[PDB]
Curated annotation (Swiss-Prot):
This is Phosphoserine phosphatase. It catalyses: O-phospho-L-serine + H2O = L-serine + phosphate; O-phospho-D-serine + H2O = D-serine + phosphate. It comes from the Archaea. Mg(2+) binds at residues 8, 10, 156. Binds 1 Mg(2+) ion per subunit. One of its GO terms (biological process) is L-serine biosynthetic process. The active site is at 8 (nucleophile), 10 (proton donor). The keyword Ribosomal protein does not apply. Belongs to the HAD-like hydrolase superfamily. SerB family. It is an enzyme of class 3 (hydrolase). Pathway: Amino-acid biosynthesis; L-serine biosynthesis; L-serine from 3-phospho-D-glycerate: step 3/3. GO terms for molecular function: L-phosphoserine phosphatase activity; magnesium ion binding.
Length: 200
């Protein structure tokens, strides 16, 4: 009976939020935080990165570090029979490196379109719509032949709600208030090993 656990990337599996890190390098991090639909908002934010040199992006994503406990938690989850996956409303260029480095089984995120080593201010992806993450959760479960009741979703905020709705077990990890009351489990200490006390 293989099970599936799906982690939100930004602020959950890693300490940072990709977009904000990439904004700081383009010096427009204040304008993006001030107007901080999820999609419409992502597109809006991305635009302010009109001609950022890929070189700068690579520099930003390098600051992305995994959340305290990530490695140990993923190791223990595999030993308990789980397929481990991550999903981001953020970007491919950052999450795929984390995926290999942490040995995740699946990784889904949006794409920062580049042209001649420069960001064209536009983005594409399957993690944009209001229900995107829940769809990703279903997709992976379907491919693995895992029943939804044997799935676990680990989120941070409002965009993780669609994922909560499809998951058998809902975990709020140092989340936004809006997510806490909706979860089955609320984790307030920033260490991913905390979930191991609750996972079957
Ligand atoms: Zn440590």
């Amino acid at each position: 009976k293989k099970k599936l656990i799906l982690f939100n990337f930004d602020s959950t599996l890693v300490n940072n939020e990709t977009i904000d890190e990439i904004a700081r390098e383009a010096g427009v991090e204040e304008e993006v935080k001030k107007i901080t639909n999820f999609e419409q908002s992502l597109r809006k934010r991305v635009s302010l990165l009109k001609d950022l040199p890929i070189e700068k992006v690579e520099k930003a994503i390098k600051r992305i570090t995994p959340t305290e406990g990530a490695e140990e938690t993923i190791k223990e989850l595999k030993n308990r029979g789980y397929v481990v996956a991550v999903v981001s409303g953020g970007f491919d260029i950052a999450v795929n490196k984390i995926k290999e480095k942490l040995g995740l089984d699946y990784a889904f995120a949006n794409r920062l379109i580049v042209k001649d080593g420069k960001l064209t201010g536009d983005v594409e992806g399957e993690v944009l719509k209001e229900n995107a993450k829940g769809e990703i959760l279903e997709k992976i479960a379907k491919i693995e032949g895992i029943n939804l009741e044997d799935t676990v979703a680990v989120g941070d905020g409002a965009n993780d709600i669609s994922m909560f709705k499809k998951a058998g077990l809902k975990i709020a990890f140092c989340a936004k208030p809006i997510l806490k009351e909706k979860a089955d489990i609320c984790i307030e200490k920033r260490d991913l090993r905390e979930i191991l006390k609750y996972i079957k």
